Amino acid sequence: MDVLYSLSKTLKDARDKIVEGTLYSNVSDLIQQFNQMIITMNGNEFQTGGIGNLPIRNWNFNFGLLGTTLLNLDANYVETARNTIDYFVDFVDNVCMDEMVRESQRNGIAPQSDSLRKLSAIKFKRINFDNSSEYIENWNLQNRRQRTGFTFHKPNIFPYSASFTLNRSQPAHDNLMGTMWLNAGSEIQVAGFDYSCAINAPANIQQFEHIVPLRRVLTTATITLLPDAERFSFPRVINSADGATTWFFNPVILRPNNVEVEFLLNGQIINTYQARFGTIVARNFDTIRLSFQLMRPPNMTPAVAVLFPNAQPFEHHATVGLTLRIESAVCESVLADASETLLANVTSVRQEYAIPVGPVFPPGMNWTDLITNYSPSREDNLQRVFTVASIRSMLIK
């Protein structure tokens, strides 16, 4: 993997730096690296593809070195370099695709394609150059057995869920108390509703809880907490828990009372925020617990009081909600966020070449299933394929 990254990095640097008119002092080191790569790759034979519709390709390297004696590069030098660069880039592209399209239930972190297995050999260690990208450096740190971290903007850490729980319920669904929620991507919207507006509750306060556990620990997370669940603030016709019938939800929104948001690690409160909305920081957590109360307004103007009678007919249902968005975070394990395109690259390659479903990943690289059942083998394979995707994206666009 380090050799493959070095190949892609060398080719990208050759594309960027070997340009007409540039001083050779600008690319002396790069050309030494390029010649070393050519020497090491010469005389070796590689095969790629053969899975799905990915064609079987054979690669042979018999290239000549690059000049090192001009003062300023000219057009001839640029074309001579580009001819070799095209072939090397194609080889790297196909090796990366072959590695992406594959998976293994045991030792998913190790190379899976025969080309990458060959590059794992000691003879190719002369191609290492630089390891400065985020994914390659995290790879090297993990191998060295040190702390790793990927920084995500809107990490898709919540498996897609949209559901409700009814604590009080009847067949007619005329008088309900409970909660509804959507956990999607990097956002949690929760809304506790009570049809009676806590008329008969002790102290006219109804308590609501919502616990969202994560599949991986998030560190140094910036979060936005806002006091209304805009998704659960309009009339709705939902289908019963067992699907038999449908019930009505005509919410009227009240302020959430006694809002507590706790970020827990190993079941212990690491961070806790009370009645505080806006930007908050969770330093280290794997569970989010949101507690909030519907408190019946002790004082009501007539227009308000008419909404909440003390008898069964309830046309307006008192709802109080919270919205929590993870803007940024750091995680030890790879995830899918809104800024990176690695998941898109892997899924696109697999779909384009019609890879049969393997023994590890879910069909279509479904991120919801993957993050729902994020297992050790899945994490290893996902990190491997994402690292290869970053290596490939260095060259292909």
Partner 1 sequence: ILMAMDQIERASDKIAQGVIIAYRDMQLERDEMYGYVNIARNLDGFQQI
Binding residues for Ca(2+): 266, 286
163 binds, among its own copies, partner 1, none (CB under 5 to 8 A by kind): none
Which residue in the set 42, 68, 174, 211 belongs to the binding site for its own copies (CB under 8 A)?
A: 174
Site for its own copies in 282-311 (CB under 8 A): 283-284, 286, 297, 299-304, 307
42 binds, among partner 1, its own copies, none (CB under 5 to 8 A by kind): partner 1
Q: Is 21 in the site for partner 1 (CB under 8 A)?
A: no
Q: Quick one: 35 or 120, whose CB is closer to partner 1? A: 35
Whether the CB-CB separation of 59 and 46 falls below 8 Å is answered with yes
Q: Quick one: 29 or 209, whose CB is closer to its own copies? A: 29
CA 94 to chain centre: 25
Q: Is 68 in the site for partner 1 (CB under 8 A)?
A: yes
43 binds, among its own copies, partner 1, none (CB under 5 to 8 A by kind): partner 1
- Min dist CB 80 to partner 1, Å, is 14
209 binds, among partner 1, its own copies, none (CB under 5 to 8 A by kind): none
Specify the amino acid at residue 104: S
Q: Is 62 in the site for partner 1 (CB under 8 A)?
A: yes
- Min dist CB 288 to partner 1, Å, is 51
- Min dist CB 380 to its own copies, Å, is 9
Q: Is 50 in the site for partner 1 (CB under 8 A)?
A: no
174 binds, among partner 1, its own copies, none (CB under 5 to 8 A by kind): its own copies
Binding residues for Zn(2+): 153
Q: Is 378 in the site for its own copies (CB under 8 A)?
A: yes
Which residue in the set 163, 167, 213, 234 belongs to the binding site for its own copies (CB under 8 A)?
A: 234
Q: Is 35 in the site for partner 1 (CB under 8 A)?
A: yes
What residues have CB less than 8 Å from 53, skipping those under 6 apart?
A: 353, 354
Whether the CB-CB separation of 66 and 85 falls below 8 Å is answered with no
Stretch binding partner 1 (CB under 8 A), from 64-72, 84-92, 267-275, 379-387:
64-72
Q: Is 207 in the site for its own copies (CB under 8 A)?
A: no
Contact flags string 209-228 toward its own copies, x per CB under 8 A:
--------x-xxxx-x-xxx
203 binds, among partner 1, its own copies, none (CB under 5 to 8 A by kind): none
Signed CA dihedral, 44, 50, 54, 57: sign only? positive
- Min dist CB 94 to its own copies, Å, is 12
How far is it, in rounded angstroms, from Cα 208 to Cα 167?
10
Map the chain to HEC letters. CHHHHHHHHHHHHHHHHCCCCCEHHHCHHHHHHHHHHHHHHCCCEEEECCCCCCCCEEEECCCCCCCCCCCECCHHHHHHHHHHHHHHHHHHHHHHHHHHCCCCCCCCCCCCCHHHHHHCCHHHHHCCCCCCCHHHHHHHHHHHCCCCCEEEECECCEEEEEEEEEEECCCCCCCCEEEEEEEEECEEEEEEEECCCCCCCHHHEEEEEEEEEEEEEEEEEEEEEECCCHHHCCCEEEECCCCCCEEEECEEECCCEEEEEEEEECCEEEEEEECCCEEEEEEEEEEEEEEEEEECCCCCCHHHHCCCCCCCCCCCEEEEEEEEEEEEEEECCCCCECCCCHHHHHHHHHHHHCCCCCCCCCHHHCHHHHHHCCCHHHHHHHHHHHHHHHHHHCCCC
Q: Is 28 in the site for partner 1 (CB under 8 A)?
A: no
Q: Is 83 in the site for partner 1 (CB under 8 A)?
A: no
- Min dist CB 71 to partner 1, Å, is 8
Site for its own copies in 81-140 (CB under 8 A): 82-83, 86-87, 105-107, 109-110, 120-122, 125-132, 137-138, 140
* Residues making contact with partner 1 (CB under 8 A): 35, 42-43, 62-65, 68
